Design a protein around this motif. Structure first.
Motif, PDB file in Angstrom:
ATOM      1  N   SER A 298      -0.820 -12.430   1.563  1.00 45.13           N
ATOM      2  CA  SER A 298      -0.431 -11.216   0.852  1.00 45.13           C
ATOM      3  C   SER A 298      -1.354 -10.052   1.189  1.00 45.13           C
ATOM      4  O   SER A 298      -0.907  -8.901   1.233  1.00 45.13           O
ATOM      5  N   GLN A 299      -2.639 -10.331   1.429  1.00 43.43           N
ATOM      6  CA  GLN A 299      -3.562  -9.278   1.837  1.00 43.43           C
ATOM      7  C   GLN A 299      -3.178  -8.700   3.194  1.00 43.43           C
ATOM      8  O   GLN A 299      -3.374  -7.505   3.440  1.00 43.43           O
ATOM      9  N   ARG A 300      -2.625  -9.530   4.083  1.00 44.71           N
ATOM     10  CA  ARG A 300      -2.154  -9.028   5.368  1.00 44.71           C
ATOM     11  C   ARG A 300      -0.946  -8.117   5.194  1.00 44.71           C
ATOM     12  O   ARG A 300      -0.833  -7.089   5.871  1.00 44.71           O
ATOM     13  N   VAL A 301      -0.034  -8.473   4.287  1.00 48.26           N
ATOM     14  CA  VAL A 301       1.134  -7.635   4.039  1.00 48.26           C
ATOM     15  C   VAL A 301       0.716  -6.304   3.426  1.00 48.26           C
ATOM     16  O   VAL A 301       1.257  -5.248   3.774  1.00 48.26           O
ATOM     17  N   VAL A 302      -0.256  -6.333   2.512  1.00 52.31           N
ATOM     18  CA  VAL A 302      -0.730  -5.099   1.887  1.00 52.31           C
ATOM     19  C   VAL A 302      -1.382  -4.193   2.924  1.00 52.31           C
ATOM     20  O   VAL A 302      -1.181  -2.972   2.916  1.00 52.31           O
ATOM     21  N   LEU A 303      -2.164  -4.774   3.836  1.00 49.26           N
ATOM     22  CA  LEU A 303      -2.844  -3.973   4.849  1.00 49.26           C
ATOM     23  C   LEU A 303      -1.849  -3.249   5.747  1.00 49.26           C
ATOM     24  O   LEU A 303      -2.052  -2.079   6.096  1.00 49.26           O
ATOM     25  N   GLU A 304      -0.762  -3.924   6.129  1.00 42.93           N
ATOM     26  CA  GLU A 304       0.227  -3.295   6.998  1.00 42.93           C
ATOM     27  C   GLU A 304       1.079  -2.282   6.243  1.00 42.93           C
ATOM     28  O   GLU A 304       1.493  -1.272   6.824  1.00 42.93           O
ATOM     29  N   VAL A 305       1.349  -2.529   4.960  1.00 47.06           N
ATOM     30  CA  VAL A 305       2.141  -1.588   4.175  1.00 47.06           C
ATOM     31  C   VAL A 305       1.331  -0.334   3.867  1.00 47.06           C
ATOM     32  O   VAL A 305       1.863   0.784   3.872  1.00 47.06           O
ATOM     33  N   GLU A 306       0.030  -0.493   3.610  1.00 48.67           N
ATOM     34  CA  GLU A 306      -0.808   0.654   3.277  1.00 48.67           C
ATOM     35  C   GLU A 306      -0.887   1.643   4.435  1.00 48.67           C
ATOM     36  O   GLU A 306      -0.896   2.860   4.222  1.00 48.67           O
ATOM     37  N   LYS A 307      -0.946   1.141   5.666  1.00 49.20           N
ATOM     38  CA  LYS A 307      -1.028   1.998   6.840  1.00 49.20           C
ATOM     39  C   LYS A 307       0.339   2.384   7.390  1.00 49.20           C
ATOM     40  O   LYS A 307       0.408   3.040   8.434  1.00 49.20           O
ATOM     41  N   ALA A 308       1.419   1.996   6.717  1.00 46.28           N
ATOM     42  CA  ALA A 308       2.763   2.376   7.124  1.00 46.28           C
ATOM     43  C   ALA A 308       3.165   3.679   6.443  1.00 46.28           C
ATOM     44  O   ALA A 308       2.865   3.898   5.265  1.00 46.28           O
ATOM     45  N   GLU A 309       3.842   4.543   7.194  1.00 48.74           N
ATOM     46  CA  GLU A 309       4.275   5.847   6.703  1.00 48.74           C
ATOM     47  C   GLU A 309       5.738   5.750   6.282  1.00 48.74           C
ATOM     48  O   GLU A 309       6.629   5.648   7.132  1.00 48.74           O
ATOM     49  N   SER A 310       5.982   5.781   4.978  1.00 48.66           N
ATOM     50  CA  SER A 310       7.335   5.671   4.445  1.00 48.66           C
ATOM     51  C   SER A 310       7.387   6.409   3.111  1.00 48.66           C
ATOM     52  O   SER A 310       6.523   7.240   2.811  1.00 48.66           O
ATOM     53  N   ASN A 311       8.403   6.106   2.313  1.00 48.87           N
ATOM     54  CA  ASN A 311       8.584   6.732   1.011  1.00 48.87           C
ATOM     55  C   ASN A 311       7.425   6.359   0.091  1.00 48.87           C
ATOM     56  O   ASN A 311       7.183   5.161  -0.131  1.00 48.87           O
ATOM     57  N   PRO A 312       6.682   7.330  -0.449  1.00 45.63           N
ATOM     58  CA  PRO A 312       5.573   6.975  -1.351  1.00 45.63           C
ATOM     59  C   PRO A 312       6.029   6.256  -2.607  1.00 45.63           C
ATOM     60  O   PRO A 312       5.321   5.369  -3.098  1.00 45.63           O
ATOM     61  N   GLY A 313       7.194   6.618  -3.147  1.00 40.23           N
ATOM     62  CA  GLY A 313       7.721   5.902  -4.295  1.00 40.23           C
ATOM     63  C   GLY A 313       8.116   4.476  -3.971  1.00 40.23           C
ATOM     64  O   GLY A 313       8.019   3.592  -4.825  1.00 40.23           O
ATOM     65  N   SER A 314       8.566   4.231  -2.738  1.00 39.58           N
ATOM     66  CA  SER A 314       8.904   2.876  -2.321  1.00 39.58           C
ATOM     67  C   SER A 314       7.663   2.050  -2.010  1.00 39.58           C
ATOM     68  O   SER A 314       7.652   0.839  -2.255  1.00 39.58           O
ATOM     69  N   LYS A 315       6.616   2.681  -1.469  1.00 40.90           N
ATOM     70  CA  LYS A 315       5.360   1.970  -1.256  1.00 40.90           C
ATOM     71  C   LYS A 315       4.691   1.630  -2.581  1.00 40.90           C
ATOM     72  O   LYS A 315       4.154   0.529  -2.747  1.00 40.90           O
ATOM     73  N   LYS A 316       4.715   2.563  -3.536  1.00 44.31           N
ATOM     74  CA  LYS A 316       4.131   2.296  -4.847  1.00 44.31           C
ATOM     75  C   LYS A 316       4.880   1.181  -5.565  1.00 44.31           C
ATOM     76  O   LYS A 316       4.271   0.372  -6.275  1.00 44.31           O
ATOM     77  N   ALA A 317       6.199   1.113  -5.381  1.00 49.20           N
ATOM     78  CA  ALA A 317       6.985   0.077  -6.043  1.00 49.20           C
ATOM     79  C   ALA A 317       6.745  -1.290  -5.415  1.00 49.20           C
ATOM     80  O   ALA A 317       6.662  -2.299  -6.126  1.00 49.20           O
ATOM     81  N   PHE A 318       6.632  -1.347  -4.087  1.00 49.10           N
ATOM     82  CA  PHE A 318       6.424  -2.632  -3.429  1.00 49.10           C
ATOM     83  C   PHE A 318       5.001  -3.135  -3.627  1.00 49.10           C
ATOM     84  O   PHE A 318       4.781  -4.340  -3.798  1.00 49.10           O
ATOM     85  N   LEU A 319       4.018  -2.232  -3.607  1.00 46.97           N
ATOM     86  CA  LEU A 319       2.648  -2.650  -3.876  1.00 46.97           C
ATOM     87  C   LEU A 319       2.471  -3.086  -5.326  1.00 46.97           C
ATOM     88  O   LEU A 319       1.612  -3.924  -5.617  1.00 46.97           O
TER      89      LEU A 319
END
Ligand SMILES: Cc1cc2nc3c(=O)[nH]c(=O)nc-3n(C[C@H](O)[C@H](O)[C@H](O)COP(=O)(O)OP(=O)(O)OC[C@H]3O[C@@H](n4cnc5c(N)ncnc54)[C@H](O)[C@@H]3O)c2cc1C
Length: 453
Positions: free
Chosen positions: A269-290
C-alpha cells in the motif's frame, strides 16, 4: 530503515544460523519492510536470510478462489526470491509446530514475521513463542505508519484518526531500499502438488449453479506481484481521474481493483501511495482515493488491534448497542436463513444482484458492500446473527476476505463502528439506513441487476 516499524515479541539468545522470515500477510519480494529488516539483521550477523511460509489447516474454511489466488502468487514469488539467492520453504501444518520445528532443525538465529492484528495470527504467535528460544521480532510491512505508532488506542471516528496519520506521513512515507541478494546460497514440497491436493479437498464445497457449472470466474483478477503492478499502473492512468466521481457507481468499473493484491500482500500500500502522490490528476479524486487506502484501510487495522472482540457485538459503540438493544424485539419484515442469503434468494433484486457479483467475481462493488450487509441486519433475528452471516459470506467468497478491512467494514455497516447516529428507525435503530429507493437515485440499479443475473 525506521526502527519504529519493528517490535520485539520475545527476547532470547541469537543462534549462529540463518535469519528466518516467517512470511504470512505480506507475500511479496518488493517493498516489504519485514523482508528488508530480515536481510539487514542477516547481514549484520554474517548469515543468510531464508523465507518460510506455512500452509495452514484452515484453508478448507474458504474456497478454491482464495486458495488458487494465493498459491499462484507464491509460485511466482518463489522464482523472484530464488533470483535474489533467497531460498523459500513452504511448510504444511500448524505454524506452532512447523515453525518451532524448522527453527530447531535449521539452527535458526533470529525469527522475524510480518504484522497482522487478526485473532488467528495471535494464536500462532502464542504457540511459536512457547516453542522457541531465539529472538522473535515482528515488522509492520502492511501499513505506511506502524499500527502501534499511528494511535495508542481505538479511534472511534475517521475525523480523529486522519490528523494523527497525516501528521506522521512525512516520517513514514518514504521510498523502499533495494533488496540485496544473499552473498552465497545457503544450505518442503512442490507448490504444484500442494495446490492439486488442496483443490481436490475443496472440490465438494465448490460454489456451483444448477447446471453443475462453477460460479466463480477466475479471469477477472490475475494473481501475482507482476499483475498487481499492472493493475496499479492502469488505475493511475485510466481510472484515478474519475475515481472521486464514480467510486459510488457499481455500474462503472472505476475502482482500483487492488484489494485482492492488498489482502495477500502481493503489492504494498505504501508503494501505491507513493505513485499516486506523484501522479498529476484530479485533486478531489486523489484526496478520495488516499482517504480509502490510508485512513479507512489502516483504521481497520487499528480497530482489530485495539478491540479483542472486533468480530462481536461488544465492540460496537455504546450508542449503537443501546439502540440495537431497544429494537431487538421489533418484528422484522423478513427473516432469511444463511442458505437463502448465500444463494441470493431474497425479495430484493438489488441485494441478490450484489450477492451474485460476490459469487461470480469474488469482489463485490464497494458501494453495494454497504447495502449488502445493512440488509443482513434488517433481515436477521438479532444483531449477533447478522454479524455471523455477514462474516461468513464475506470471508468465504470475497477474494479480499479474512481481512481487517472486512471486519471493520462489517462493524461499520451493522454496528455503526467509525460512524455516527442517524434517524431512529425500527429494527435497525439509529444505524445508518440504506434504502432501495436511495440507491436508485444514486446509480442505475437496473443495469447492475441485469449484469448479474
Ligand atoms: C460489508 C463489507 C465487506 C467488505 N469486505 C472487505 C473485505 O473482505 N476485504 C477488504 O479488504 N475490504 C472489504 N471491504 C471494504 C471495501 O469494500 C473494499 O475494500 C473495497 O471494495 C475493495 O475493492 P477496491 O480495491 O477496488 O476499492 P478502492 O476504492 O479502489 O480502494 C483501494 C483500497 O483502499 C482500501 N479501501 C477502500 N475502501 C475501503 C473500506 N471501505 N474499508 C477499508 N479499506 C478500504 C482498500 O484497501 C482498497 O483495496 C468491505 C466493506 C464492506 C462494507
Amino acid at each position: 530503515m525506521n526502527p519504529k516499524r519493528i517490535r520485539a515479541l520475545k527476547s532470547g539468545k541469537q543462534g549462529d544460523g540463518p535469519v528466518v522470515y516467517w512470511m504470512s500477510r505480506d507475500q511479496r519480494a518488493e517493498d516489504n519492510w519485514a523482508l528488508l529488516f530480515s536481510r539487514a539483521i542477516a547481514k549484520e550477523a554474517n548469515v543468510p536470510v531464508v523465507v518460510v511460509f506455512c500452509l495452514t489447516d484452515e484453508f478448507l474454511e474458504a474456497g478454491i478462489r482464495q486458495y488458487e489466488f494465493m498459491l499462484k502468487g507464491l509460485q511466482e514469488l518463489e522464482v523472484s526470491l530464488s533470483r535474489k539467492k533467497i531460498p523459500s520453504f513452504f511448510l504444511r501444518g500448524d505454524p506452532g509446530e512447523k515453525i518451532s520445528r524448522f527453527v530447531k532443525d535449521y539452527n535458526a538465529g533470529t525469527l522475524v514475521t510480518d504484522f497482522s492484528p487478526l485473532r488467528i495470527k495471535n494464536q500462532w504467535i502464542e504457540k511459536v513463542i512457547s516453542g522457541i528460544s531465539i529472538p522473535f521480532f515482528e515488522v509492520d510491512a502492511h501499513n505506511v505508519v506502524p499500527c502501534w505508532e499511528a494511535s495508542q488506542k481505538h479511534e472511534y471516528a475517521a475525523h480523529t484518526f486522519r490528523p494523527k496519520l497525516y501528521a506522521l506521513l512525512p516520517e513514514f512515507l518514504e521510498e523502499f531500499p533495494e533488496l540485496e541478494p544473499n552473498s552465497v546460497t545457503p544450505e518442503v514440497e512442490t507448490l504444484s502438488d500442494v495446490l492439486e491436493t488442496g483443490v481436490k479437498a475443496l472440490l465438494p464445497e465448490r460454489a456451483l449453479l444448477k447446471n453443475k457449472d462453477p460460479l466463480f470466474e477466475p479471469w477477472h483478477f490475475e494473481p501475482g506481484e507482476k499483475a498487481a503492478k499492472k493493475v496499479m499502473e492502469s488505475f493511475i492512468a485510466d481510472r484515478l481521474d474519475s475515481y472521486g466521481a464514480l467510486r459510488n457507481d457499481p455500474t462503472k468499473n472505476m475502482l482500483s481493483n487492488l484489494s485482492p493484491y492488498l489482502h495477500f500482500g502481493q503489492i504494498s500500500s505504501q508503494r501505491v501511495v507513493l505513485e499516486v502522490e506523484k501522479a498529476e490528476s484530479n485533486p478531489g479524486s486523489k484526496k478520495a482515493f488516499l482517504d480509502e487506502i490510508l485512513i479507512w484501510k489502516e483504521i481497520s487495522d487499528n480497530f482489530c488491534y485495539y478491540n479483542p472482540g472486533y468480530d462481536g457485538f461488544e465492540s460496537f459503540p455504546s450508542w449503537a448497542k443501546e439502540s440495537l438493544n431497544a429494537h431487538r424485539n421489533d418484528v422484522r419484515s423478513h427473516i432469511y436463513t444463511l442458505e437463502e442469503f448465500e444463494a441470493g434468494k431474497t425479495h430484493d433484486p438489488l441485494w441478490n444482484a450484489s450477492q451474485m457479483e460476490l459469487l461470480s467475481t469474488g469482489k463485490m462493488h464497494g458501494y453495494t458492500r454497504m447495502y449488502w450487509a445493512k440488509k443482513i441486519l434488517e433481515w436477521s433475528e438479532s444483531p449477533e446473527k447478522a454479524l455471523e452471516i455477514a462474516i461468513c459470506l464475506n470471508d468465504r467468497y470475497e477474494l479480499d476476505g479474512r481481512d481487517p478491512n472486512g471486519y471493520a467494514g462489517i462493524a461499520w455497516s451493522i454496528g455503526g463502528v467509525h460512524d455516527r447516529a442517524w434517524g431512529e428507525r425500527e429494527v435497525t435503530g439509529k444505524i445508518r439506513y440504506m434504502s432501495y429507493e436511495g440507491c436508485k437515485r444514486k446509480f442505475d440499479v437496473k443495469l447492475y441487476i441485469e449484469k448479474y443475473s
